[PDB]
Design an enzyme around this catalytic site. Structure first.
Site, PDB file in Angstrom:
ATOM      1  N   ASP A   1     -17.828  -5.192 -10.670  1.00  0.00           N
ATOM      2  CA  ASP A   1     -17.670  -5.980  -9.457  1.00  0.00           C
ATOM      3  C   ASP A   1     -19.023  -6.584  -9.075  1.00  0.00           C
ATOM      4  O   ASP A   1     -19.172  -7.799  -8.966  1.00  0.00           O
ATOM      5  CB  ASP A   1     -17.146  -5.108  -8.304  1.00  0.00           C
ATOM      6  CG  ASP A   1     -15.673  -4.709  -8.477  1.00  0.00           C
ATOM      7  OD1 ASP A   1     -14.871  -5.586  -8.868  1.00  0.00           O
ATOM      8  OD2 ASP A   1     -15.323  -3.518  -8.198  1.00  0.00           O
TER       9      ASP A   1
ATOM     10  N   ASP B   1     -10.273   4.106  -7.777  1.00  0.00           N
ATOM     11  CA  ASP B   1     -10.475   2.719  -7.288  1.00  0.00           C
ATOM     12  C   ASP B   1     -10.163   2.608  -5.789  1.00  0.00           C
ATOM     13  O   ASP B   1      -9.267   3.300  -5.296  1.00  0.00           O
ATOM     14  CB  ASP B   1      -9.529   1.775  -8.035  1.00  0.00           C
ATOM     15  CG  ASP B   1      -9.591   0.346  -7.514  1.00  0.00           C
ATOM     16  OD1 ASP B   1     -10.561  -0.369  -7.831  1.00  0.00           O
ATOM     17  OD2 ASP B   1      -8.647  -0.040  -6.780  1.00  0.00           O
ATOM     18  N   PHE B   2     -10.888   1.733  -5.088  1.00  0.00           N
ATOM     19  CA  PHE B   2     -10.665   1.510  -3.646  1.00  0.00           C
ATOM     20  C   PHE B   2     -10.334   2.753  -2.856  1.00  0.00           C
ATOM     21  O   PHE B   2      -9.294   2.827  -2.166  1.00  0.00           O
ATOM     22  CB  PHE B   2      -9.540   0.498  -3.468  1.00  0.00           C
ATOM     23  CG  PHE B   2      -9.391  -0.027  -2.064  1.00  0.00           C
ATOM     24  CD1 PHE B   2     -10.499  -0.377  -1.304  1.00  0.00           C
ATOM     25  CD2 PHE B   2      -8.115  -0.247  -1.522  1.00  0.00           C
ATOM     26  CE1 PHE B   2     -10.338  -0.945  -0.011  1.00  0.00           C
ATOM     27  CE2 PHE B   2      -7.940  -0.815  -0.221  1.00  0.00           C
ATOM     28  CZ  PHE B   2      -9.035  -1.155   0.522  1.00  0.00           C
TER      29      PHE B   2
ATOM     30  N   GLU C   1     -14.729   5.336  -5.703  1.00  0.00           N
ATOM     31  CA  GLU C   1     -15.356   4.086  -5.300  1.00  0.00           C
ATOM     32  C   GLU C   1     -15.140   3.982  -3.795  1.00  0.00           C
ATOM     33  O   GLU C   1     -14.061   3.549  -3.374  1.00  0.00           O
ATOM     34  CB  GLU C   1     -14.705   2.859  -5.950  1.00  0.00           C
ATOM     35  CG  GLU C   1     -15.445   1.560  -5.586  1.00  0.00           C
ATOM     36  CD  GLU C   1     -14.551   0.337  -5.535  1.00  0.00           C
ATOM     37  OE1 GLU C   1     -13.322   0.452  -5.350  1.00  0.00           O
ATOM     38  OE2 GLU C   1     -15.102  -0.766  -5.685  1.00  0.00           O
TER      39      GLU C   1
ATOM     40  N   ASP D   1       0.864  -1.194   0.000  1.00  0.00           N
ATOM     41  CA  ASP D   1       0.000   0.000   0.000  1.00  0.00           C
ATOM     42  C   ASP D   1       0.875   1.210   0.000  1.00  0.00           C
ATOM     43  O   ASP D   1       1.845   1.320   0.774  1.00  0.00           O
ATOM     44  CB  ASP D   1      -0.938   0.061   1.211  1.00  0.00           C
ATOM     45  CG  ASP D   1      -2.188  -0.669   0.979  1.00  0.00           C
ATOM     46  OD1 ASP D   1      -2.067  -1.839   0.627  1.00  0.00           O
ATOM     47  OD2 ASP D   1      -3.298  -0.087   1.140  1.00  0.00           O
TER      48      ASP D   1
HETATM   49 CA   LIG Z   1      -1.062  -3.888   1.256  1.00  0.00          CA
HETATM   50 CA   LIG Z   2      -4.215   1.922   1.865  1.00  0.00          CA
END
Ligand SMILES: [Ca+2]
Ligand SMILES: [Ca+2]
Ligand SMILES: [Ca+2]
Length: 404
Positions: free
Chosen positions: A291, A180-181, A205, A149
């Site tokens: 999704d 995204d995310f 999202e 991340d």
């Molecule tokens: Ca990760």
């Molecule tokens: Ca993160």
């Protein structure tokens, strides 16, 4: 007038000849149906075929959907028909190309010759211990399991990512972003990228679970779910920002409401129950995406009622997003184009006024901008609730539209 269109599904990367080359043939129909913006998949090299595990962000040529030339050509054909192109921006996590001393993949390569994006483990959220060298800041949001991340608090990260985003605009022609995310990092970090690249819109999202209960159906009250989304928008900058969210509250409520529980489609204040009723200018509504629908089917709209879902979103406030398969593969093309024509010829926008006229189990009826009346549900007659001057404009399985 604003109408989005998701231009891919979970299976698009397998299209023979290339997904973008195939799409060249779909541009005219999309434009003619009144679509103003097309969301395209993650364009960069990705360890996963679908693109959501990006590595060399400048390496478009390694995409499974098509190379930089093909992509530029599709975006150019979109722009020639007055349609904008939205890029699927995956920046919560990123995969490294090379292993370091520890033998861990945390040495990134941006895809160019120089050092742009050639990150080290210092750029990894220190708490994603599976990859970091413990020196970074803590993740500002949720973690993505399969890849490192990114520490969006890292200054180099912010600068090189914004530079890359500006290059997607300058060198490829993209106009806006789909984040995204978005739960992955804070709206405050989202704000940095949106503010730093002036996209025409940045739809995020932000997907949290819906409050359910007992049997499994979602609760009628969903203020908590939509408050979170509203709050996200406030933190990303509110009205001053290009930022907005997919209306997952509405998605969840509608999923259930069509199953003979249309009474779910109005809150106790007489307002739409999803983000649409609180911040319609910031709500991107949809029936299914890659999704929830498609072949991943995480939360599919009842397949026999999909057009009722479009009768709802395409006539209502909020910015609607049409799903590729629904327009092209299910035979609903003419019906969907006709609903968009009604929206457009009546000047309905994300902020159009909504007056709900009937919210019963098998009949939802609402009036928009006092120019369009729509009805969904299996009830044969709702004529008593149609105002004076309206005449049937369009209709199909369990839905109808009237115009003055
Ligand atoms: Ca990760
Ligand atoms: Ca993160
Ligand atoms: Ca490099």
């Amino acid at each position: 007038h604003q109408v989005l269109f998701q231009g891919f599904n979970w299976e698009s990367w397998k299209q023979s000849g290339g997904w973008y080359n195939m799409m060249m043939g779909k541009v005219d129909d999309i434009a003619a149906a009144g679509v103003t913006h097309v969301w395209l998949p993650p364009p960069s090299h990705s360890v996963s075929n679908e693109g959501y595990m990006p590595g060399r962000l400048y390496d478009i040529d390694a995409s499974k959907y098509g190379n930089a030339a093909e992509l530029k050509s599709l975006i150019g054909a979109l722009h020639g028909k007055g349609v904008q192109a939205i890029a699927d921006i995956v920046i919560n996590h990123r995969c490294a190309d090379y292993k370091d001393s520890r033998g861990i993949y945390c040495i990134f390569e941006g895809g160019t010759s120089d050092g742009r994006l050639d990150w080290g483990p210092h750029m990894i959220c220190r708490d994603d211990t599976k990859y970091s060298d413990g020196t970074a800041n803590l993740d500002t949001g949720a973690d993505f399991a399969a890849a490192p991340d990114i520490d969006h608090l890292n200054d180099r990260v912010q600068r090189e990512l914004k530079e890359w985003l500006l290059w997607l605009k300058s060198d490829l022609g993209f106009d806006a972003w789909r984040l995204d995310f978005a739960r992955g990092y804070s709206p405050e970090m989202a704000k940095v990228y949106i503010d730093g690249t002036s996209p025409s819109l940045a739809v995020a999202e932000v997907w949290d679970n819906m409050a359910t209960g007992g049997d499994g159906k979602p609760n009628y009250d969903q203020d908590a779910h939509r408050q979170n989304l509203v709050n996200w928008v406030d933190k990303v900058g509110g009205a001053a920002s290009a930022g907005m969210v997919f209306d997952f509250t509405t998605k969840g409520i509608l999923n259930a409401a069509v199953e003979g529980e249309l009474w779910r489609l109005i809150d106790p204040q007489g307002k739409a129950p999803g983000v649409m009723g609180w911040w319609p200018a910031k709500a991107v509504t949809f029936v299914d995406n890659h999704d929830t629908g498609s072949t991943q089917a995480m939360w599919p709209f009842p397949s026999d009622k999909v057009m009722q879902g479009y009768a709802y979103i395409l006539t209502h406030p909020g910015i609607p997003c049409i799903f590729y398969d629904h327009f092209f593969n299910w035979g609903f093309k003419d019906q969907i184009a006709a609903l968009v024509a009604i929206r457009k010829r009546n000047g309905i926008t994300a902020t159009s006024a909504l007056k709900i006229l009937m919210h019963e189990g098998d009949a939802y009826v609402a009036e928009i901008d006092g120019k369009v009346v729509v009805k969904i549900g299996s009830r044969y007659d709702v004529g008593a609730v149609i105002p004076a001057g309206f005449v049937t404009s369009a209709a199909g399985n369990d839905y109808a539209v009237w115009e003055k």
